[PDB]
Amino acid sequence: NELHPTLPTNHNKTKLLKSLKNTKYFQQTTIDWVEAGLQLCRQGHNMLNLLIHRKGLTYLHLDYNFNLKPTKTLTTKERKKSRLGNSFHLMRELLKMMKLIVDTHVQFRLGNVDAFQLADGIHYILNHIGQLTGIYRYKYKVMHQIRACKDLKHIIYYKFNKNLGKGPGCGFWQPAWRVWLNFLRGTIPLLERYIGNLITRQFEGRLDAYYDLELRNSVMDDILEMMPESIRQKKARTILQHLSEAWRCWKANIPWDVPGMPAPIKKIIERYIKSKAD
Amino acid sequence: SVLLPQLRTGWHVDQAIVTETKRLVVIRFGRKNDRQCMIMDELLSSIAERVRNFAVIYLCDIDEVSDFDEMYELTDPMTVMFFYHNKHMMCDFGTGNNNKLNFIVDDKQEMIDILETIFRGARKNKGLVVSPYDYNHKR
Amino acid sequence: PKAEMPPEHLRKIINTHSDMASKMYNTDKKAFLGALKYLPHAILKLLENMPHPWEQAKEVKVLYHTSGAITFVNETPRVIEPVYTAQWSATWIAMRREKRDRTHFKRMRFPPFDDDEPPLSYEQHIENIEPLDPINLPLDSQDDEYVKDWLYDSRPLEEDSKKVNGTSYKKWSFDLPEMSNLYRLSTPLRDEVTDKNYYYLFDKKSFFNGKALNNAIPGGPKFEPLYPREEEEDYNEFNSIDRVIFRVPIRSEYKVAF
Amino acid sequence: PSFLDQEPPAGYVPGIGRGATGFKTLELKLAQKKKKRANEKSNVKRQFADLKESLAAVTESEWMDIPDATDFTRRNKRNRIQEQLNRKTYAAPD
RNA sequence: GGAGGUCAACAUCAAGAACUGUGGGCGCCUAUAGAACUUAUAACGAACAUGGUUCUUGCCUUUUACCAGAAC
RNA sequence: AAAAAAUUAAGGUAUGUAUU
């Protein structure tokens, strides 16, 4: 991190949320953080289902834990239809993680948990996201974050669970939280583009290989540009043939001199050959 | 490229598919500027003469006629789509989409085999054929 | 211009919204299509704004869609660094004591709700329920008098004029005793060899050198080479073993140091 | 290519006739956002182009009387001989 | 008038000496743009995530996955 | 009282006739 820092200047942008708010559609207020969390879970749930619905995948369903299941064992033809992209799954798993965290606060609010257990739980959640969600199946990269969290677990427990020291309690979660907060920051826009593109489609539906072919195209155009357009097409086809023949002749060491040709044309083709040869 | 003709309306596409009873109708769907839609436009043009007796070729541009984008679902620079007696033909190149063609084929020869295979299998009403060379790895 | 409104309006919208639900609200290009895409952004504000283990609850400002499409959380957490440090250390203390207190510490099962089980409404199920008190600490009243009166608020200091910038909460300054309490409380969490001298071969520069030279310190991390080729090993008069005089390891630490 | 010539449809959709089978404020805001980024954020032709201007001079009679199809390697003859040589095979004797 | 506004809009954003151009005021002073050099990249942020290209390590020679180094 | 995990996914659609 220290060795390859970045440094940005962005005069240009004023916030998504500051901009988003302006105009008729949006409104602002206050709310219980938990309540908001609950809303978010439902929103995501609905939106993913909408996507699925639009795609016609009526034999799949999401449960309230964001697990995608089959309603009927499907045929391989239907399985091919079902093959759903990684980006979608990254969103889904992301939501799953979020849901999990929210739910523990809900249960604490119910008073069924314990403030200490709660802290231990959310700590645990962050540490073990690779097991609880399995998101890594759709980005393998995220392992870096997972491994980091694991390492943090090891260090912190050595520091307070080596006195007194066996099971849970714990409840410190700052470090691991930070890791995931940064991770998300780095992925948001990828998902935004994928989703955005998807939705607009819902409403819409040198090198050797490259160079030689471009070369011809450029040359033919200009020559086809000058053609008096009483005779353009006929005049052209034989225009193509000379380039092919002159390039054959270059290969074979035959000179390629021709009877009646205007000097200007004869220049261009030689220039082309010199370029192609190189 | 100027060898092979172009189709300037979706109504030129449809009549062209119908009126050719005895031969394949091969179409490249894609747009002039593309890197990969220029390359195929070559490998076909060279082949079009050799094959004139069983296959007919045309060129179409997604931007010129966008009417056909949703029905056949066209994505990426270009798609090669084969038609015989109004019946959309279909082949498995080992690539995991049996409809149309995507990738750029490499040799002139391996391209002529595929056309020839499709025609021969097609003549018998068979809806699937197998490309002898399966470029799943390639694309 | 941009007025704030009552939360009951929002509640009304979502009460209406549930009915609209899912596929039936297919139309909405102007609200639904626009609202969702930035929805992932919305998650970031909420997680970042997690309430913290000493808070009972956090009320936050949100931007919601009139259609009931989405909720974004408005607030950004501005904290006072020494205070925040002290607060976290406080809870660290508490955790150790609590663990000492009993053997059977129950950890959560996880997947808190059943797959098919639907959402409990916050408004009825939760709003009545009560906070149930959180962590905190039994700070001595005499020692931490200045600190204790405010230590566990969402703003570590309310809106003092002398103590603080003001309402906005950028910029802060304390008295000496305030600092000393904060410092003393934060001590368990922050322990370092404060002298520059302890980090003789553990600073950034030394790491950079170890990387560049492909010679990690025993403690230190090790990278790939950076410079590829170690191929040339040419015996020669300048180099030759009869000519050289041999004592000492020439440990990698020497290489980094010099 | 007779159809290629003609140019007129009925006011007709392409899919249906053949018998075909298939195998605003938010927007404005988005546009604005994009703009806030555009604001913030060939050779071959050059080489030749200069020649192409050079061409302009040439007369229309000369454009016509241009020799048309000259082969200098006799590629066709050699290719045919090669195909004939490579045609059949034979079985090796016992 | 003043503080505060978790309200917005519009500009810029490391610092310094020295060259060139433009504008204003009475050769001098001030502002803006470009180029070069230094500081340590003392930090616009004692925080640090993702992606594209080009190279170099492993690969099924495939990915909407990656391994771990480099530069842009 | 000697010891279980740290790896993921696409390249897997039978034609063909008949009915809707």
Curated annotation (Swiss-Prot), chain A:
Coiled coil: none annotated. It is found in: Nucleus. Present with 468 molecules/cell in log phase SD medium. Component of the U4/U6-U5 tri-snRNP complex composed of the U4, U6 and U5 snRNAs and at least PRP3, PRP4, PRP6, PRP8, PRP18, PRP31, PRP38, SNU13, SNU23, SNU66, SNU114, SPP381, SMB1, SMD1, SMD2, SMD3, SMX2, SMX3, LSM2, LSM3, LSM4, LSM5, LSM6, LSM7, LSM8, BRR2 and DIB1. Functions as a scaffold that mediates the ordered assembly of spliceosomal proteins and snRNAs. Required for association of BRR2 with the spliceosomal U5 snRNP, and the subsequent assembly of the U4/U6-U5 tri-snRNP complex. Functions as a scaffold that positions spliceosomal U2, U5 and U6 snRNAs at splice sites on pre-mRNA substrates, so that splicing can occur. Interacts with both the 5' and the 3' splice site, as well as the branch region. Has a role in branch site-3' splice site selection. Associates with the branch site-3' splice 3'-exon region. Also has a role in cell cycle. The MPN (JAB/Mov34) domain has structural similarity with deubiquitinating enzymes, but lacks the residues that would bind the catalytic metal ion. This is Pre-mRNA-splicing factor 8. It comes from Saccharomyces cerevisiae (strain ATCC 204508 / S288c). The chain holds residues 532 to 821 of 2413 of the full protein.
Curated annotation (Swiss-Prot), chain B:
Keywords: Acetylation, mRNA processing, mRNA splicing, Nucleus. It holds the Pfam family DIM1. The keyword Nucleus applies. GO terms for biological process: mRNA splicing, via spliceosome. One of its GO terms (cellular component) is U4/U6 x U5 tri-snRNP complex. Signal peptide: none annotated. It is found in: Nucleus. InterPro entries: Dim1, Thioredoxin-like_sf. The keyword Acetylation applies. CDD domains: DIM1. Transmembrane segments: none annotated. Component of the U4/U6-U5 tri-snRNP complex composed of the U4, U6 and U5 snRNAs and at least PRP3, PRP4, PRP6, PRP8, PRP18, PRP31, PRP38, SNU13, SNU23, SNU66, SNU114, SPP381, SMB1, SMD1, SMD2, SMD3, SMX2, SMX3, LSM2, LSM3, LSM4, LSM5, LSM6, LSM7, LSM8, BRR2 and DIB1. Essential role in pre-mRNA splicing. Also essential for entry into mitosis (G2/M progression) as well as for chromosome segregation during mitosis. Belongs to the DIM1 family. This is Spliceosomal protein DIB1. It comes from Saccharomyces cerevisiae (strain ATCC 204508 / S288c) (Baker's yeast).
Swiss-Prot record, chain D:
It is found in: Nucleus. Coiled coil: none annotated. Component of the U4/U6-U5 tri-snRNP complex composed of the U4, U6 and U5 snRNAs and at least PRP3, PRP4, PRP6, PRP8, PRP18, PRP31, PRP38, SNU13, SNU23, SNU66, SNU114, SPP381, SMB1, SMD1, SMD2, SMD3, SMX2, SMX3, LSM2, LSM3, LSM4, LSM5, LSM6, LSM7, LSM8, BRR2 and DIB1. Participates in pre-mRNA splicing. Part of the U4/U5/U6 tri-snRNP complex, one of the building blocks of the spliceosome. Present with 2250 molecules/cell in log phase SD medium. This is Pre-mRNA-splicing factor 6. The gene is PRP6.
